[PDB]
Every structure is written in structure tokens, then in C-alpha cells.
Tab-separated table of C-alpha atoms and ligand atoms in Angstrom:
chain	number	residue	atom	x	y	z
X	158	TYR	CA	84.873	85.520	48.830
X	159	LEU	CA	88.334	85.951	47.076
X	160	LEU	CA	86.341	87.714	44.362
X	161	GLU	CA	85.437	90.194	47.122
X	162	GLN	CA	89.003	90.181	48.617
X	163	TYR	CA	90.079	91.023	45.015
X	164	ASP	CA	87.960	94.068	45.193
X	165	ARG	CA	89.731	94.771	48.512
X	166	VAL	CA	93.342	94.355	47.185
X	167	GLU	CA	92.736	96.708	44.397
X	168	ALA	CA	90.221	98.764	46.437
X	169	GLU	CA	92.744	101.763	46.985
X	170	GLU	CA	93.949	101.629	43.318
X	171	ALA	CA	96.831	99.376	43.671
X	172	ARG	CA	98.707	96.711	45.199
X	173	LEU	CA	101.865	94.380	44.432
X	174	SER	CA	102.735	93.365	47.956
X	175	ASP	CA	102.523	89.833	48.795
X	176	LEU	CA	98.884	89.756	49.236
X	177	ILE	CA	98.571	88.869	45.718
X	178	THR	CA	101.413	86.464	45.913
X	179	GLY	CA	99.111	84.403	48.343
X	180	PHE	CA	96.137	84.740	45.934
X	181	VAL	CA	95.029	82.538	43.099
X	182	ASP	CA	98.679	81.886	41.524
X	183	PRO	CA	98.272	78.663	39.260
X	184	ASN	CA	101.291	76.449	40.155
X	185	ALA	CA	102.778	74.429	37.024
X	186	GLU	CA	100.743	71.420	36.967
X	225	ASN	CA	106.563	87.004	41.177
X	226	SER	CA	104.554	90.084	41.533
X	227	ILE	CA	101.282	89.738	39.412
X	228	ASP	CA	100.300	92.189	36.926
X	229	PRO	CA	96.577	93.652	36.792
X	230	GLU	CA	96.014	92.243	33.244
X	231	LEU	CA	97.036	88.709	34.550
X	232	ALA	CA	94.782	88.833	37.688
X	233	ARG	CA	91.783	90.542	35.841
X	234	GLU	CA	91.942	87.664	33.453
X	235	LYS	CA	92.318	84.849	36.198
X	236	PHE	CA	89.469	86.392	38.300
X	237	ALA	CA	87.119	86.745	35.286
X	238	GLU	CA	86.049	82.903	34.837
X	239	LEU	CA	85.539	82.538	38.648
X	240	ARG	CA	83.177	85.605	38.706
X	241	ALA	CA	81.568	84.120	35.771
X	242	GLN	CA	80.945	80.843	37.799
X	243	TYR	CA	79.787	83.160	40.640
X	244	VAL	CA	77.201	84.962	38.659
X	245	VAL	CA	75.762	81.927	36.907
X	246	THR	CA	75.751	79.557	39.708
X	247	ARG	CA	73.522	81.379	42.210
X	248	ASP	CA	70.297	81.884	40.536
X	249	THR	CA	70.274	78.299	39.425
X	250	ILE	CA	70.420	77.137	42.859
X	251	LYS	CA	66.575	78.027	42.963
X	252	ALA	CA	66.156	75.451	40.396
X	253	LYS	CA	63.759	73.082	42.078
X	254	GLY	CA	66.227	72.158	44.825
X	255	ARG	CA	69.364	73.794	46.512
X	256	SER	CA	71.490	70.738	45.273
X	257	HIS	CA	69.613	70.459	41.730
X	258	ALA	CA	71.799	68.271	39.673
X	259	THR	CA	72.192	71.219	36.867
X	260	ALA	CA	72.915	73.829	39.150
X	261	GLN	CA	74.819	71.461	41.398
X	262	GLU	CA	77.143	70.528	38.493
X	263	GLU	CA	77.688	74.224	37.778
X	264	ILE	CA	78.651	74.593	41.571
X	265	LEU	CA	81.000	71.503	40.704
X	266	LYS	CA	82.474	73.652	37.893
X	267	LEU	CA	82.977	76.393	40.379
X	268	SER	CA	84.625	74.093	42.725
X	269	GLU	CA	86.896	72.069	40.517
X	270	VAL	CA	87.899	75.401	38.492
X	271	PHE	CA	88.943	76.464	41.874
X	272	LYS	CA	90.615	73.153	42.741
X	273	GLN	CA	93.402	73.539	40.243
X	274	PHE	CA	94.189	76.878	41.802
X	275	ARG	CA	95.818	76.918	45.264
X	276	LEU	CA	94.391	77.979	48.568
X	277	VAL	CA	95.057	81.644	49.565
X	278	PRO	CA	97.016	83.184	52.672
X	279	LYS	CA	96.142	83.765	56.259
X	280	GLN	CA	93.420	86.010	55.606
X	281	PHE	CA	91.530	82.993	54.573
X	282	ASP	CA	91.571	81.953	58.230
X	283	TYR	CA	89.359	84.832	58.706
X	284	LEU	CA	87.042	83.411	55.955
X	285	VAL	CA	87.025	80.118	57.926
X	286	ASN	CA	86.570	81.921	61.169
X	287	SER	CA	83.862	84.023	59.490
X	288	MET	CA	82.124	80.607	59.271
X	289	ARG	CA	83.366	79.467	62.391
X	290	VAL	CA	81.543	82.719	64.038
X	291	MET	CA	78.318	81.443	62.427
X	292	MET	CA	78.378	78.081	64.168
X	293	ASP	CA	79.944	79.939	67.198
X	294	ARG	CA	76.448	81.687	67.152
X	295	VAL	CA	74.508	78.816	65.710
X	296	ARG	CA	75.590	75.956	67.755
X	297	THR	CA	75.593	78.025	70.813
X	298	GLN	CA	72.150	79.283	70.307
X	299	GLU	CA	70.969	75.723	70.368
X	300	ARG	CA	72.873	75.144	73.616
X	301	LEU	CA	71.331	78.306	74.878
X	302	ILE	CA	67.826	77.050	73.883
X	303	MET	CA	68.767	73.908	75.702
X	304	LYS	CA	69.934	75.917	78.711
X	305	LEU	CA	66.117	77.168	78.871
X	306	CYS	CA	64.837	73.631	78.098
X	307	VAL	CA	66.444	70.495	78.876
X	308	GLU	CA	67.496	70.897	82.633
X	309	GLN	CA	64.465	72.437	84.356
X	310	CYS	CA	61.708	70.105	83.524
X	311	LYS	CA	61.796	66.405	82.168
X	312	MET	CA	62.238	66.249	78.396
X	313	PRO	CA	62.980	62.998	76.204
X	314	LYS	CA	66.144	62.640	74.395
J	1	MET	CA	109.737	97.255	45.056
J	2	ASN	CA	112.637	96.855	47.641
J	3	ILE	CA	114.074	100.040	48.908
J	4	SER	CA	117.799	99.677	48.943
J	5	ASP	CA	117.713	98.737	45.277
J	6	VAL	CA	115.837	101.835	44.218
J	7	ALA	CA	117.967	104.141	46.599
J	8	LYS	CA	121.243	102.679	44.993
J	9	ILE	CA	119.810	103.235	41.657
J	10	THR	CA	118.969	106.798	42.393
J	11	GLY	CA	121.948	107.380	44.860
J	12	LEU	CA	119.717	108.336	47.877
J	13	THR	CA	119.220	106.281	51.094
J	14	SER	CA	115.960	105.108	52.841
J	15	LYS	CA	116.653	107.702	55.431
J	16	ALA	CA	116.792	110.769	52.974
J	17	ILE	CA	113.997	109.096	51.067
J	18	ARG	CA	111.690	109.003	54.343
J	19	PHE	CA	112.698	112.563	54.942
J	20	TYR	CA	111.288	113.530	51.557
J	21	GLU	CA	108.322	111.379	52.012
J	22	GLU	CA	107.426	112.974	55.387
J	23	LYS	CA	107.712	116.214	53.654
J	24	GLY	CA	104.906	115.165	51.382
J	25	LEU	CA	106.907	116.058	48.333
J	26	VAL	CA	106.235	112.863	46.365
J	27	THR	CA	103.621	110.092	45.947
J	28	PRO	CA	103.418	107.998	49.055
J	29	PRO	CA	104.526	104.503	48.345
J	30	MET	CA	102.241	101.851	49.866
J	31	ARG	CA	103.780	99.446	52.424
J	32	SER	CA	103.257	95.628	52.372
J	33	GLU	CA	101.968	93.247	55.102
J	34	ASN	CA	105.407	93.210	56.326
J	35	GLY	CA	105.845	96.810	56.150
J	36	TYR	CA	108.203	97.356	53.270
J	37	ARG	CA	107.952	100.913	51.338
J	38	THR	CA	106.315	99.464	48.047
J	39	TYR	CA	108.047	101.572	45.581
J	40	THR	CA	107.188	101.698	41.928
J	41	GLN	CA	108.093	103.464	38.658
J	42	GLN	CA	106.138	106.593	39.398
J	43	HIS	CA	107.821	106.833	42.809
J	44	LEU	CA	111.163	106.179	41.014
J	45	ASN	CA	110.869	109.099	38.661
J	46	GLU	CA	109.153	111.503	40.961
J	47	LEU	CA	112.125	110.790	43.268
J	48	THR	CA	114.572	111.407	40.315
J	49	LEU	CA	112.933	114.769	39.682
J	50	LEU	CA	112.638	115.508	43.531
J	51	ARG	CA	116.592	114.949	43.616
J	52	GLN	CA	117.726	116.815	40.694
J	53	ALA	CA	115.412	119.783	41.571
J	54	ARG	CA	117.419	120.947	44.626
J	55	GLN	CA	120.494	120.165	42.641
J	56	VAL	CA	119.252	122.870	40.125
J	57	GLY	CA	118.387	124.577	43.319
J	58	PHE	CA	114.527	124.627	43.503
J	59	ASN	CA	114.088	124.006	47.241
J	60	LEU	CA	112.005	121.543	49.184
J	61	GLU	CA	108.766	123.398	48.659
J	62	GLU	CA	109.586	124.368	44.995
J	63	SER	CA	110.778	120.951	44.001
J	64	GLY	CA	107.521	119.684	45.412
J	65	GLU	CA	105.903	122.064	43.202
J	66	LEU	CA	107.715	120.674	40.224
J	67	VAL	CA	106.684	117.120	41.311
J	68	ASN	CA	102.918	118.156	41.728
J	69	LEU	CA	103.338	119.512	38.192
J	70	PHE	CA	104.838	116.109	37.198
J	71	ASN	CA	101.497	114.512	38.379
J	72	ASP	CA	99.438	117.442	36.668
J	73	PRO	CA	98.903	116.731	32.946
J	74	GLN	CA	97.543	120.469	32.355
J	75	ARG	CA	100.944	121.820	33.658
J	76	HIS	CA	102.034	125.052	32.310
J	77	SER	CA	105.502	125.049	30.781
J	78	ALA	CA	105.288	128.731	30.956
J	79	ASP	CA	105.003	128.685	34.623
J	80	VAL	CA	107.917	126.078	34.802
J	81	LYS	CA	110.157	128.506	32.857
J	82	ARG	CA	109.169	131.312	35.212
J	83	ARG	CA	110.493	129.471	38.078
J	84	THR	CA	113.388	128.492	36.169
J	85	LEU	CA	114.364	132.009	35.459
J	86	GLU	CA	113.449	133.161	38.703
J	87	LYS	CA	115.800	130.841	40.283
J	88	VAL	CA	118.246	131.984	37.705
J	89	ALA	CA	117.878	135.452	38.957
J	90	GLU	CA	118.352	134.438	42.723
J	91	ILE	CA	121.544	132.439	41.693
J	92	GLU	CA	122.753	135.576	39.818
J	93	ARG	CA	122.343	137.866	42.805
J	94	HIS	CA	123.889	135.120	45.124
J	95	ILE	CA	126.981	135.051	42.502
J	96	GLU	CA	127.052	139.013	42.655
J	97	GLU	CA	127.105	139.302	46.239
J	98	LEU	CA	129.664	136.596	46.725
J	99	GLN	CA	131.539	138.598	44.132
J	100	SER	CA	131.180	141.511	46.589
J	101	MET	CA	132.594	139.416	49.351
J	102	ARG	CA	135.610	138.011	47.494
J	103	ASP	CA	136.397	141.547	46.281
J	104	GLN	CA	136.473	143.064	49.764
J	105	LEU	CA	138.362	139.982	51.003
J	106	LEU	CA	141.119	140.502	48.320
J	107	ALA	CA	141.239	144.075	49.087
J	108	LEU	CA	141.943	143.374	52.696
J	109	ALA	CA	144.126	140.556	51.899
J	110	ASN	CA	146.601	142.456	49.391
J	111	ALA	CA	146.852	145.321	51.772
J	112	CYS	CA	148.104	142.894	54.657
J	113	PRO	CA	151.741	142.609	54.570
J	114	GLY	CA	151.734	138.702	55.556
J	115	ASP	CA	154.922	139.327	57.541
J	116	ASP	CA	154.118	137.285	60.474
J	117	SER	CA	153.373	140.387	62.330
J	118	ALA	CA	151.053	141.147	65.253
J	119	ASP	CA	150.227	144.462	63.624
J	120	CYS	CA	147.865	142.733	61.044
J	121	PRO	CA	145.935	145.751	59.324
J	122	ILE	CA	142.958	143.173	58.737
J	123	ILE	CA	142.508	142.484	62.373
J	124	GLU	CA	142.402	145.902	63.628
J	125	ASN	CA	140.323	147.398	60.769
J	126	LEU	CA	137.816	144.722	61.417
J	127	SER	CA	137.384	146.048	64.861
J	128	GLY	CA	135.935	149.562	65.437
J	129	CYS	CA	138.997	150.385	67.822
J	130	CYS	CA	141.834	152.940	67.720
G	1	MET	CA	127.466	147.817	80.392
G	2	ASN	CA	124.416	145.715	79.791
G	3	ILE	CA	123.638	143.645	76.679
G	4	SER	CA	121.636	146.356	75.474
G	5	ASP	CA	124.223	149.185	75.502
G	6	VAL	CA	126.912	147.076	73.584
G	7	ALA	CA	124.209	145.664	71.614
G	8	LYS	CA	122.868	149.085	70.201
G	9	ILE	CA	126.510	150.301	69.818
G	10	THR	CA	127.672	147.153	67.904
G	11	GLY	CA	124.302	146.133	66.437
G	12	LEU	CA	123.642	142.600	67.481
G	13	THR	CA	120.266	141.014	68.715
G	14	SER	CA	120.522	139.907	72.281
G	15	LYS	CA	119.764	136.192	71.524
G	16	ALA	CA	122.663	135.983	69.264
G	17	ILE	CA	124.795	137.798	71.788
G	18	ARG	CA	124.116	135.522	74.421
G	19	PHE	CA	124.632	132.828	71.936
G	20	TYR	CA	128.160	133.796	70.990
G	21	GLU	CA	128.867	134.182	74.558
G	22	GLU	CA	127.826	130.531	75.334
G	23	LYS	CA	129.729	129.567	72.203
G	24	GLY	CA	132.908	130.699	73.959
G	25	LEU	CA	133.595	133.079	70.935
G	26	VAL	CA	133.848	136.155	73.423
G	27	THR	CA	135.290	136.549	76.718
G	28	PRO	CA	133.116	135.975	79.905
G	29	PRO	CA	131.416	139.216	80.875
G	30	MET	CA	131.544	139.755	84.718
G	31	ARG	CA	128.431	139.597	86.566
G	32	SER	CA	126.382	142.022	88.634
G	33	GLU	CA	124.379	141.913	92.095
G	34	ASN	CA	121.858	139.865	90.134
G	35	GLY	CA	123.786	137.950	87.329
G	36	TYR	CA	123.694	141.007	84.822
G	37	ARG	CA	126.478	140.651	82.329
G	38	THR	CA	128.647	143.834	83.116
G	39	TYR	CA	130.358	144.290	79.750
G	40	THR	CA	133.104	146.718	78.947
G	41	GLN	CA	134.738	148.297	75.861
G	42	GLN	CA	136.768	145.137	75.500
G	43	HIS	CA	133.606	143.066	74.919
G	44	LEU	CA	132.135	145.748	72.593
G	45	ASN	CA	135.332	145.575	70.408
G	46	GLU	CA	135.157	141.892	70.777
G	47	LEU	CA	131.485	141.757	69.425
G	48	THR	CA	132.448	144.310	66.557
G	49	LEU	CA	135.172	142.161	65.443
G	50	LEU	CA	133.203	138.919	65.655
G	51	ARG	CA	130.641	140.501	63.401
G	52	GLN	CA	133.069	141.629	60.902
G	53	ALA	CA	134.361	138.197	60.949
G	54	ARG	CA	131.085	136.743	60.588
G	55	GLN	CA	129.184	138.816	57.937
G	56	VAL	CA	132.436	138.085	55.841
G	57	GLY	CA	131.542	134.662	55.817
G	58	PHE	CA	133.774	132.803	58.128
G	59	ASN	CA	131.929	130.102	60.215
G	60	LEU	CA	131.453	130.651	64.082
G	61	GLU	CA	134.648	128.820	65.136
G	62	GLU	CA	136.840	130.698	62.473
G	63	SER	CA	135.431	134.004	63.659
G	64	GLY	CA	135.702	133.146	67.310
G	65	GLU	CA	139.357	132.056	66.949
G	66	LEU	CA	140.191	135.266	65.157
G	67	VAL	CA	138.605	137.060	67.829
G	68	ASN	CA	140.864	135.222	70.330
G	69	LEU	CA	143.819	136.178	68.074
G	70	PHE	CA	142.906	140.026	68.704
G	71	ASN	CA	143.646	139.502	72.205
G	72	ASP	CA	146.931	137.331	71.695
G	73	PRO	CA	149.465	140.143	70.657
G	74	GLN	CA	151.574	137.134	69.606
G	75	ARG	CA	149.402	137.001	66.559
G	76	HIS	CA	150.818	136.703	62.967
G	77	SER	CA	149.214	138.732	59.983
G	78	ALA	CA	150.512	135.953	57.663
G	79	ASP	CA	148.033	133.605	59.445
G	80	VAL	CA	145.357	136.246	58.967
G	81	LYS	CA	145.972	136.564	55.204
G	82	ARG	CA	146.237	132.920	54.472
G	83	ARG	CA	143.149	132.399	56.418
G	84	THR	CA	141.607	135.168	53.985
G	85	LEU	CA	142.878	133.379	50.929
G	86	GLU	CA	141.431	130.050	52.032
G	87	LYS	CA	137.988	131.636	52.489
G	88	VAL	CA	138.565	133.198	49.056
G	89	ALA	CA	139.342	129.646	47.681
G	90	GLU	CA	135.908	128.541	48.995
G	91	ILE	CA	134.079	131.549	47.643
G	92	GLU	CA	135.946	130.958	44.149
G	93	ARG	CA	134.563	127.466	44.320
G	94	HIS	CA	131.208	128.351	45.552
G	95	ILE	CA	130.671	131.209	42.762
G	96	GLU	CA	132.081	129.095	39.861
G	97	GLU	CA	129.822	126.223	40.780
G	98	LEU	CA	126.872	128.724	40.922
G	99	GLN	CA	127.755	129.909	37.486
G	100	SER	CA	128.148	126.608	36.084
G	101	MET	CA	124.837	125.181	37.354
G	102	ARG	CA	123.186	128.380	36.398
G	103	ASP	CA	124.578	127.939	32.837
G	104	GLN	CA	122.798	124.480	32.433
G	105	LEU	CA	119.537	126.357	33.941
G	106	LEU	CA	120.087	128.729	31.132
G	107	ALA	CA	120.444	125.908	28.664
G	108	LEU	CA	117.315	124.185	29.783
G	109	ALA	CA	115.386	127.404	29.750
G	110	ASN	CA	116.304	127.849	26.232
G	111	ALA	CA	114.995	124.321	25.687
G	112	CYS	CA	111.684	124.881	27.094
G	113	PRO	CA	109.010	126.430	24.742
G	114	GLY	CA	107.469	128.184	27.955
G	115	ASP	CA	103.941	128.287	26.285
G	116	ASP	CA	101.567	126.697	28.862
G	117	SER	CA	102.592	123.355	27.432
G	118	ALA	CA	102.135	120.110	29.147
G	119	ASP	CA	105.012	118.515	27.387
G	120	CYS	CA	108.045	120.850	28.547
G	121	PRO	CA	111.259	119.062	27.804
G	122	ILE	CA	112.483	120.006	31.317
G	123	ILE	CA	110.119	117.956	33.314
G	124	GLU	CA	111.113	115.105	30.881
G	125	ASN	CA	114.850	115.915	31.362
G	126	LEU	CA	115.174	116.099	35.295
G	127	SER	CA	112.837	113.393	35.510
G	128	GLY	CA	114.635	109.840	34.884
G	129	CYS	CA	112.758	109.463	31.561
G	130	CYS	CA	114.277	108.293	28.052
E	401	CU	CU1	148.406	141.967	58.741
E	402	CU	CU1	108.255	123.515	28.490
């Protein structure tokens, strides 16, 4: 997540190039400093750390933990989307379905053609 | 930073800067996604030192040592002044041998008549003839 | 005479001799059965003169044209001496520049404590700081 890519961008001790100018960057509803970023990336990491263990709470979409997830989201919603690297993050989900979907087809490739099967 | 801005501040050009960089004599500035050499203040003042050191006369290697001291917080000012006065000594000897040059040059000159003649004593005495 | 003879008489290195030949500073030495450059006393005097123009400090072209003057008995001792004085002018500017920058080296050497200190004034002076 952009938490992890924020560990990346500062992995080699520094960056002020445009990778950050695509990152969080609240528009009024420009190379960013380390102070400003660490401030902006603290509350979303707080929502990260608090929001996961509550998903266990009697249901993955449990109302308390799910509204905590809603806080994570809505807090991210004032902030903007982030640059082309996020395509990988979407593709990093595509590659899930690219496998998952395909595996069902692959299972169907062993199942539905050879013998009779209902639908 | 942008690169031309830094080089017009410090007077250098991107070409000379990249020579210095390939010599490994300063911090390597990062690039960007596009590829612009990401300069900083550290790079700025390291460059200023690497510039003025050869102006002083500390060579590529020796100016690079001044730089890696500029990174070093332990740096021995003692050493620094040894380097200083050593280069003072080389510049002194340089001056002295150049003085020997100019002395012999003027010894040869003042003896020459300068009377648009082919019998120039300087020419024939520079060759081991006659 | 081979390159070795005129070399060990005058005192050049063979690589530099062939260089000065290819530069056209000296005359064409005639060739042997097998391409060996049959030198002469003319060529030897030429190389002696060419050294004694070089080690004086004249660049490659100035020394070469002087060697060509040696073979032109229309030459003018006046041209020789004004050449000497232009080179003297160069050496004067060079040595006074050396002295001046060595004087600021002396000033900053006085400035430093030279006592194994991290905070030397000099590293803070050549660096674009404060
Ligand atoms: Cu003369
Ligand atoms: Cu000092």
C-alpha cells in the first residue's frame, strides 16, 4: 500500500523527485519535505494498524471494524489518487484474478467439456 | 534540483559537473523518474568546495580528499593544514623554477642584438653546433 | 643514423622523437632499404634545438617554427627576441598568479588552528557556507 511505497521512496535515505509529487498531496478543498510527509503518513498508518485486527471481530464486515475501514477510506478520499505506479497496484490485483479466474476456467477445462455436467 | 540553475549559481556547466561526478569526487545526486540529476544543498556546497580546491590547486584527487573530509565530522584540521602548506611548498618550487626560466630567458634575450639579423645568438646557442 | 644514434646523442625518447617527426617540427628523415629513418647531423642539430626550445617552455608549435627558422637564413634575431619577451610575459603572469594565490593559501593557513579539529575555518571558507 502507499504506506509501503512510502517506505520505498525513502528506502534509499531520500527522494524529492516527482514520485512524491504524485503521492498523497491534499488539494485545497511543490517538493514535499520529510516532516510534512511523515505527518501526513502517520494517521493513515494509524488506521492501518487499528483497522486489521478488528476485521476478525465476529465478521470480516463487522459494523464496528467496518466503520473503522470506512474511516480509513474516507480519510483517503479527501486525498487524491497517486501516479502510474498505482497501476501496478491495480495490476497487482489483476494478477490475482488473472490467476484466480483463470484457475476456475482451468478447473472447468478439466470438468465441463469431457463428461455431462449441469449448469 | 534543476541542474542549469545550480551550475549557473556555481558557474560550472552540466558537462564539467558530470566529469567531476564520474570522478567520484562528490555525493552522487539521485536522478528522478525522468532522469534529471537531483541536486541538493549538500551537493551544492560539495561542488563549491570541489571547485575552489583546484582553484587553490588541490588536484582532482586531493580536492576529492577535501570533499570526503567535508563529509567526515572527525576531520583533522591538522591534516588539512599539512595539505595546505605542502601545496604551498609545491607552488613555491614552481615559482622558483619559473624564476630560473625567466632568468635564463632574459639572459638570452638581453644578449641578443634584436637587429633583424639572421646571426641571432639565441638560435645558434640553443643548438649544439659550431 | 638511426633513431638510437641521434637519440643518445641529443637525449630524447624514441616515442617522442617519432612524435616530433609526425608533428612536422623536424624535417623528413630519409628512409632505408626497410624504412629505417636515416638521420643526419642536420636532424641531430634540429632535435637539439627543438629540445632547447621545448624545455625553455615554448609549446610544440612555437618550438617547431623556431626550428624551421634555424634552416631559414633569412631569419631575424629581432623576431627571436620578441618571441623571448612574449614568453617572458607569460611567465611573469604565471609566477605572479602563483605568488598571489599562494599568499591567500598562507592567509588561510594562518586562519586554521591545525589541531585535529573538526571545525576548521578553511573547510567552511572554500565551501559555499555562511
Ligand atoms: Cu639574435
Ligand atoms: Cu582548522
